[PDB]
Symmetry: C3
Subunit: 258 residues, 3 copies
């Protein structure tokens, strides 16, 4: 009955795989976002020791589906812009509140909100096929997923502003240098290197896992909530204005002209 | 007319170039800092979308002109140590409050306050001729430019203390690994690379740029102001006293 | 002192770890009390800084678990309380210390042996050194304020990987992740350190101290609060029903098998 994700619960952990059918290329829309929240809600309440999040196919996550979004905005700009900003806020908050470890395997591009959510997970393992970009300014939006606070925290201001203002694309290795990725594995053995460590993690006392994450997350929880809310209030402002989609349209024009 | 800087307003941005006459090696005396501040006031008020900061010459910025400063010190410690501290504090504060993006292109050495000011700008692009150092302890001064808070935040305590206490020099690649530089470019195409990126940023919605900067900068602004205040009080204490020019050496 | 060598000369105090009552420079409450005593004396005398290093092929393999297990067989409840307080007091000595502590790491730093390092000022490592916090594998939550300091120095992805997954970092990898100031080759390491210590010791002691005070002031209360939280969780874990399930594992492992 989930349409856009595959969920598997086995060997002490829940595995959630992004596999979107209501949107292309693992892009996010409110329906995809709700299914991830539902799957994480169940994992938070069952005996899962941790969650592994990964993706089916060649893209980890393209971030927001702006074509889906523009169609909504043409129907009722004021109502739909509010609704998208709240959907994002709730989606992001799910990651902020989640009490067990979220381990991410990134095997392809992670773009926009698909990259911004990574600092809200616990461990990120990538291979060289993965790259990371937050092309917010290109799409004409301010940042999301608490990246306005988290990117300066993990890579420092100079690097964070380059990603957030300049739309710099990072290889897996460069994202590791910039604190986005925990470790990079060869593509050929990526799955086995990820699964061996998930098995090791799932063999630990899940109380010790939870206590440790609680210790790491507690100095930042408030600040994350406050960031998420500020960012979403800005997005409402931008997406509710008549010119909100102009940068995105120019981007699409370039893409189709290429 | 500005003596120590060149200012070009064009194509959606203001380009400020350090090219000091009252000092050597783009050193900063209170006159240079006032001109930078005044050029930033006007960019903040006009239709400029962002500021590109770079330098003419083989040096980006040597930080404080300590000989200009020595001259002034032994004509009146109390008045001149107070004036220099407060000039640093207002210069640093201009960057803390500035609302639009400041992109910096660093094409040679950035030393002391010339390096410290970098974390208060937005993006820093460097070539291999650039290197970076904060030789505070060697000069017998404590740090400035909010580096006492910003350096630990961008590179971690161990690396920050090595910069601030030990006077370590970082190559452009090392400064990039330590969070001081956004990206390092080949010197051959450095100007081209910077300008293509500046043109892309200047084509963006200016309101989206400023909103984005505001969201990044808001959690830190009070901390940066308080750090700037603390640093400048410790400099008054040091420079005010008789034996605080004792390390300034040759 | 039985477990450390203290040399005061040339404007600095050199504290060398060289334990007799433990394997691999490991820390029992005895060793901890000597280190604290040596620091207390350096803090009050005319030393400008402290150089901390080790004798032998291991910097510090962290908590002396052989000693702790010897106590735990006697009285679990009483001895777990005393151990948590020993740690808390030890870590607090580093949080409070006003003079620069420079560390020369010439072999593995494990557990508390690695977690204290972000409480020091400058860390120089031999290319031979490596770094690990294998807390979870032995059923422990983290110590030494690493729950806050690791995310601050390497960002949450890398920090969680250290603290949850037991990742080992080479000296170079630990330099990229903010734990080590600079790495020197084994051949030149001793001389590289000493030329720099000599340079630092020739500086104005008041300038050194004011600089450190400016660097440490935004964080002192947060470090204290982190130390107290971590020590509380350690008490609760060690007092738990499953709290000892993973500790004895230690007896069967060499230090490069954690």
């Amino acid at each position: 009955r989930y349409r856009d994700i595959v969920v598997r619960k086995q060997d002490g952990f829940t595995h959630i795989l992004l596999s979107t059918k209501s949107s292309e290329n693992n892009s996010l829309n409110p329906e995809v976002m709700r299914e991830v929240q539902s799957a994480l809600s169940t994992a938070a309440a069952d005996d899962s020791k941790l969650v592994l999040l990964s993706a089916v196919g060649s893209v980890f996550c393209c971030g927001l589906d702006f074509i889906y979004f523009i169609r909504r905005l043409t129907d009722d700009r004021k109502r739909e812009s509010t609704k998208m900003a709240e959907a994002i806020r709730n989606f992001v908050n799910t990651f902020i509140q989640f009490k067990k470890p979220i381990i991410v395997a990134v095997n392809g591009p992670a773009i926009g909100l698909g990259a911004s959510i990574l600092p809200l997970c616990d461990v990120v393992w990538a291979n060289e096929k993965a790259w990371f970009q937050t092309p917010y300014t290109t799409f004409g939006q301010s940042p999301d997923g608490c990246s306005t606070v988290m990117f300066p925290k993990i890579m420092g201001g100079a690097s964070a502003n380059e990603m957030l203002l300049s739309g710099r694309k990072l290889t897996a290795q460069e994202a590791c240098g910039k604190g986005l990725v925990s470790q990079v594995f060869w593509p050929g053995t990526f799955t086995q290197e990820v699964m061996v460590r998930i098995k090791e993690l799932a063999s630990c006392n899940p109380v010790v896992l939870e206590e440790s994450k609680a210790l790491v997350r507690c100095n930042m929880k408030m600040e994350l909530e406050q960031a998420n809310e500020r960012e979403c209030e800005v997005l409402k402002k931008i997406w509710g204005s008549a010119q909100g989609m102009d940068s995105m349209l120019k981007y699409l024009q370039r893409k189709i002209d290429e």
